[PDB]
């Protein structure tokens, strides 16, 4: 999500969270660092909510559970459409987290002499205004210089504007190609319609002719049998064509589904939760021993 990848940086800067330039995708992130920024920004938006928990990592897994559950509740304050909970907070698809994070980002002679008189009066008024403007310019300038001094060395409007320009060109290209394709579609339909008419006549003639001369000789009846077998071959193969094309469409659908689970990242996070569960059972066995011993 190229620009959203860049918003990783922009948002980190916006957060003041560490912005390691090597951190360039949600793939990079510890959920811990994500949550640290969560603490920062909630404590910004609702300090009463956000200040309640330290940005420091809880080493105690249970404390991680509990704090994250509190984050879930903080979201429960609000009508986010999605399900909440620490299970999510560990292992989302990066879109899902992205989506939520944006849901967060939401919330931050006579006449001659007389004319000399008018001339000089106007010049007087003009000089007055010019002096005033000198004051305006310089105090503004002083301000502007102090601002220039403060100015963040942040990215210019242009860079994004260019990315935009590129994107636009690509898209419009697409739609143009689309348009020609649409025409081509129409053309092929016209061609096929003509083909239908000529082919219909072609068979009517061919069938009639071969029938007539097949009357003259059973061998020409075999010629008619050849025609039938070949024509059925054609009709069958045409059907097969239709079938295969459809099949490959569904193949692409399956490919979409491949990508779908790939975005889900299901199995890897599953392996993670499994080994986590192993650790947590060991932990719980410690707790069970302690409950026995107390």
């Amino acid at each position: 999500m190229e620009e959203a990848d860049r918003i990783l940086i922009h948002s980190l800067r916006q957060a003041g969270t560490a912005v390691p330039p090597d951190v360039q995708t949600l793939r990079a992130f510890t959920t811990e660092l994500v949550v640290e920024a969560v603490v920062r920004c909630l404590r910004v938006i609702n300090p009463a909510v956000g200040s309640g928990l330290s940005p420091l990592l809880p080493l105690a897994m249970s404390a991680r559970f509990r704090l994250a559950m509190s984050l879930a509740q903080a979201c429960m304050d609000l009508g986010y459409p999605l399900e909440l909970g620490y299970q999510n907070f560990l292992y989302p698809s990066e879109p899902d987290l992205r989506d939520l994070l944006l849901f967060l980002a939401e919330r931050l002679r006579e006449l001659e002499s007389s004319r000399r008189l008018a001339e000089i009066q106007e010049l007087h008024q003009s000089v007055r205004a010019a002096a005033e403007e000198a004051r305006r310019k310089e105090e503004v300038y002083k301000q502007l210089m102090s601002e220039l001094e403060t100015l963040p060395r942040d990215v210019s409007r242009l860079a994004y504007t260019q990315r935009i320009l590129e994107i636009v060109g690509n898209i419009r290209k697409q739609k143009e190609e689309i348009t020609k394709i649409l025409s081509d579609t129409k053309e092929l339909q016209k061609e096929i319609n003509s083909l239908s008419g000529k082919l219909d006549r072609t068979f009517a003639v061919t069938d009639e002719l071969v029938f007539k001369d097949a009357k003259k000789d059973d061998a020409v009846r075999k010629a008619y049998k050849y025609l039938a077998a070949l024509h059925e071959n054609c009709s069958q193969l045409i059907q097969t064509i239709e079938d295969t094309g459809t099949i490959m469409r569904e193949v692409r659908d399956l490919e979409e589904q491949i990508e779908t689970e790939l975005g889900k990242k299901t199995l890897s996070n599953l392996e993670k939760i499994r080994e986590d569960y192993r650790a947590l059972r060991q932990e719980n066995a410690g707790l069970l021993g302690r409950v026995r011993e107390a």
């Binding site: 409007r157 504007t161 935009i164 320009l165 636009v168 898209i171 419009r172 649409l182």
Partner: protein, 891 residues
Amino acid sequence: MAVFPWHSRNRNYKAEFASCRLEAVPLEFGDYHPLKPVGSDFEPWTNKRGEILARYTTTEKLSINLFMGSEKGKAGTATLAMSEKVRTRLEELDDFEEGSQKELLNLTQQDYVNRIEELNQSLKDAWASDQKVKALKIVIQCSKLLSDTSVIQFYPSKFVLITDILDTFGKLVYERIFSMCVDSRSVLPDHFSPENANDTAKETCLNWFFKIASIRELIPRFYVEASILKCNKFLSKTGISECLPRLTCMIRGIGDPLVSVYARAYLCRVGMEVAPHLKETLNKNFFDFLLTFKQIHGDTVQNQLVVQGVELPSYLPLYPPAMDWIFQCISYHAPEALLTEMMERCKKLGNNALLLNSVMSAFRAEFIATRSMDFIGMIKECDESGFPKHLLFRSLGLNLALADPPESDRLQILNEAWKVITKLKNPQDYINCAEVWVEYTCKHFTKREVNTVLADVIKHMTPDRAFEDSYPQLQLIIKKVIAHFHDFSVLFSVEKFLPFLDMFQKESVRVEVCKCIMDAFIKHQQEPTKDPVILNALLHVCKTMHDSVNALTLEDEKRMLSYLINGFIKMVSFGRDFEQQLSFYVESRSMFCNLEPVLVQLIHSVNRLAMETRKVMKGNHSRKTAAFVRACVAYCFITIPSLAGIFTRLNLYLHSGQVALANQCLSQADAFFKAAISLVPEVPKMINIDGKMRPSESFLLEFLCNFFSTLLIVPDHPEHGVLFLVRELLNVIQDYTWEDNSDEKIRIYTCVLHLLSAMSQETYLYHIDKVDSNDSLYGGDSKFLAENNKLCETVMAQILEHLKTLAKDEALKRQSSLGLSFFNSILAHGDLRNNKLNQLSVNLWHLAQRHGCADTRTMVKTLEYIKKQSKQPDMTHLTELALRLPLQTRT
């Protein structure tokens, strides 16, 4: 020669105002100002007939099996005499039945129609051939076709057609006898006395009438005699009346229920048409009809149904057409007391349910409505096999939609009908009757009653494909809702309509309803506002329609629908919810890509907002206002590339520019304009609108001077050529492959020179608060002023080249008009105390005149006016010029 050095005048715009201004009169309180202050309610047979002929097909394989005598007749040695010769006249009418037959089993509807029409032509010929005896033969054939009831469900249609044919026949008969009465001097009046029928016409009518009385079979004799009753006008006006109760008694002979009923229906049509008292005799016929119903329970129906095995539910549909015609005939202006007494007899009768149905159908709504409470009981008295009570419901729903008892009674009846109706499981029949009742339900009852109906119908839909078959009903239903329903929010209070929408599947149908919905909204809603929940639902539907749209739909329909959508969009009005409204825009855009005009008008909303926003802030501009501004800037910008229409997008560069002037955004200005110029190559030679081709050069040029109106106002930047780009712009223009006809290009060049005349001032003409004037920035002085002068002089050279080429072109009218217009441009400012420009002006004047094509007449008008202007000070060198000017002429 070097190019003559142009110098402009300089203007005092207030002085130029004072000299030009109308110093108008302010007007006074209360002073005058321009705005200072049978009857046609008897529905015709044709309608009934058409509908019946549509419905009453049958499944039975039709047949025609009839003796005929079209070609042949007697010639044998029969024993006859004068009396028997008179009998032989009728034997002619017999001979078709003595004749051989045409036989056609298992006819379809149309084959039967066609054979009946064959007989129809035979009759038409017999009439036209004056074979009135043979015409009578064929009419007897019609009556025997009436005799064959065997295909009983089709048979009503048979009756219909035979009655239509024999009606025409009776008309023809009356006209013939009248023509016999008429001596061809002029036609006798309709009120003619029976004595006015002359002796021979009387005796001829008597002969045919005696034939009729001598008809052996009841069916021809009665039915034809009903038509001859018209001929009674020849013979006795009172005889008509005498015959009608006589016919009433005569009708008693037919034990066949269908024939007798339909005979009565025919006689009712006739009687109603002829005169009022005939309805009273029809009341007498109804008195007979009570006994006819008595027999209708009796042996004939039972025996025949047993013989064929026909189902009464199948049997019942055949009669209501006759019933309803009769009921129209009497009830047309029957009093409520009379109709009530009639109901008394009907209630005295048994198994009356179909009678009740036809009663409710015909009889008048106030009368029916008052009784409607009684009908609760009396319909409970009914039996579905006497007549289906839900169909009673449906007819009644028509009735109630028309008129209703008191509101309490409405409430009770609501309970009775709906609760009963909910019991009814067959969703098709359920929906059939319910959809009728829906309109009346909408008429009186409210959101909860509606919600109840909603629930029961939604439960009844489950074989939903049948519900989808029943889409038309649902459509009618919701239209009723709409017409009846006048608060959108309360629809949302119903909510169940939303699941109702959810039940649907067919996009287009849903869309049709959405159309209805929004126009109704347009009627009731006239006020722009917000309700987030209402909004969310609406926007869901907006989504629904937008995404419903494929690339392929009909362009103009797409257009109109978009228009419709765009209209409600103006309603979107949060008040002070600026950033919220902003976000709303954002989403709207972010989905609703699908039609440019929608986008256009969205951007309008953006612009309108931002414009007012600055207007309200009045210099009090917060940092928020700046961020708001720049966000708007981006948003609108990012639209622009996505948009289709190049010209529109170009003026959007204009809009974008002028708003950038409204605040900051000057580099963004430049961006719009780099794009603009890049769009200049993108200009096609011809442009299609409405399917039609138009030449772009006008439209762009047409723009471009309005754009000049801007172009000098803009301050820019020595980091660039301060409007190098504008030169560069003009360069691209000149590079662009205009026609030789694009002298208009040069006209624009002139306009640019008008701009440069503006550049020439020490102070520009008019200004916006925080954008003052470029003149100061470079400093006006001969070195930088000469930069633009130089450029002008360059274009001047170009001008001269082209114009004299136009002389080479024989574009002489074009060239002369152009040059003199340019002269008139010079006239705004050209120093001709600069003798070099002065000579230039001489060159133009005479060289244009020299070939005589110049409209010198206008030039003389022009130059006398220029001498009049020459009085003025700079114009005193124009005074010297125009006095010195000779003038070559057309004149």
